[PDB]
């Protein structure tokens, strides 16, 4: 086998678009609100302090 | 027939006409029995009930 | 592999991998060019689309189609279904020493 | 609208439709802003001794014919004129070096800058002069980090004290040696770190020995080159964002020639960014007249390199495309499809070359193509593996290795060893006549005869009947 | 293979540079040849049969 | 031989361990001499 070094991280469609949505339910974040971040049409804070 | 009109006229007299015969494709022909020879083989275009 | 007559036959995974590599190389080119962020975001969305169509075509959005005007078979379509690896090639096979 | 559809092209249109087009004067204003930014960057670069000496070394290479002038200058504001202007620049540089000994050095900045700014460089090497300062700024700022990390946080020195003493001089030891009798918790604890901090200053003060300019002058100019490179970049963002509709009006035409619609308005966008760098408003032409050449040249060149699995070069793409419009202009001049003989006398090339162009394999057929009158059979189910050897042929090899094993056992041990060496039987690489000469100490010629007699024995019957069945 | 080239050296029968790819009757059928048609490209010399 | 089959997620390090090299170009074969 070989490999392709992606220039940006990319989500795995199996772990995102499956109905239980392991990415969605691991973060307790709804899939409708995750697809907005993956589509570059919304920001999400990442440890923005208290 | 290609016709070029004259400026400032809704349906005014044309200035030039050029009538030419242009070849556009070949259409297959039906034999005396209702079949088509298409690539050396005889084919039947079956009717449709829609 | 080439057929007889000078023409080849290819798998759809070649098309999908080529699309992934083209978009990845263009994204690297845009990042090295200091492009405006709208172009870079569009390229990142396109790369995310290409990989998601390689792994499972048609699950997210619409299925990419080839020159056949048919949705090209992805990595996940080679495992599922009545004509996947499991049901067509592993649970029942074509067998030597046999005839009808 | 966010978020209703997936449709990654619709999202791009939604994003790009929020920027309004430029008038004929807005383009001029943005071009002037770009020129002002580039001029500020050039002024900041032209205040560096390293660029002067590099250019002098490059002209020295040219005087030795180790480099071209066209590799260095993109014209002026004539090779003999270029050489005499370079001689004038060298004279200005040497008189500047002679008069550089503070008061007169200030006026040498304004005199040397007038000469170096009259030369127009190339984009490839001009970035090297920019990179000459970017590396210089990294080394200075890296040493600036350590002074903060070894005196303020380590010794609990106040941050404002790092501004009162260090910020303002940056060369003297007021905060290093004169800041010990200040009755502070850090003043008596700076002795432990004084061994490495001063040497870090020695590396920082070695930078003062690199270009002949102070630590402030490095930062006083780099801040002007960080605004010049940020003003010309914000203006080029406005010109590209305003003209994104021009790419879509062009890229919609080449829409079904192998690349998706988004792969064309993204290769055009790279050509749009190329036109902004080279656009000159002093010609008085519209941007759309100049940008359309670059957008159409990047979309078209992209299809030549990315539309086919088996990629053919551009020079062969421009021949198939020419042949595809000549053979369709003779469709409506003759009434039927032409023949390769007739294209040869029309395209002015031999029939053999045209037969090669027409024999170029098209896009390969997908192996998932349905091949029967059903959705069951595919094209990939009928393609067999031709790299395998038949077990009838594979069981003949295991029968030949045994037939030649009994035969060689019927020979003398000397001839059953030279035959196993002249032919690589049941071992590695076969040897020549000379290479087995050292093995047995015999000369090269006799082994050729020893092998010849071994070959002679095996031709005889009663030792060759079964062997003849293998041919 | 080494045994093959030893066999060639013993029997002196050199190899052939061409491969027999002739057309032959499918196994099982037994007929009579009633027609032979030869098509030739317009750059190639015609054999005596054509 | 083996007694069980185990399945899990693959780290980027695991994927770089499987690979024998990086694929950097979309080209497949040469159009004139059909070599990879
Ligand atoms: C339609 C029929 C199958 C019956 C259903 C016949 C008619 C044309 C035949 C193929 C073509 O020659 C192309 C190709 C040539 C290559 O060398 C490898 C074999 C291929 C797949 C041939 C095998 C197969 O027999 C085909 C599909």
Curated annotation (Swiss-Prot), chain B:
The chain holds residues 101 to 150 of 1342 of the full protein. DNA-dependent RNA polymerase catalyzes the transcription of DNA into RNA using the four ribonucleoside triphosphates as substrates. The RNAP catalytic core consists of 2 alpha, 1 beta, 1 beta' and 1 omega subunit. When a sigma factor is associated with the core the holoenzyme is formed, which can initiate transcription. This is DNA-directed RNA polymerase subunit beta. Coiled coil: none annotated. Belongs to the RNA polymerase beta chain family.
Swiss-Prot record, chain E:
It comes from the Bacteria. DNA-dependent RNA polymerase catalyzes the transcription of DNA into RNA using the four ribonucleoside triphosphates as substrates. The RNAP catalytic core consists of 2 alpha, 1 beta, 1 beta' and 1 omega subunit. When a sigma factor is associated with the core the holoenzyme is formed, which can initiate transcription. Belongs to the RNA polymerase beta chain family. This is DNA-directed RNA polymerase subunit beta. It comes from Escherichia coli O157:H7. The gene is rpoB. The chain holds residues 896 to 945 of 1342 of the full protein.
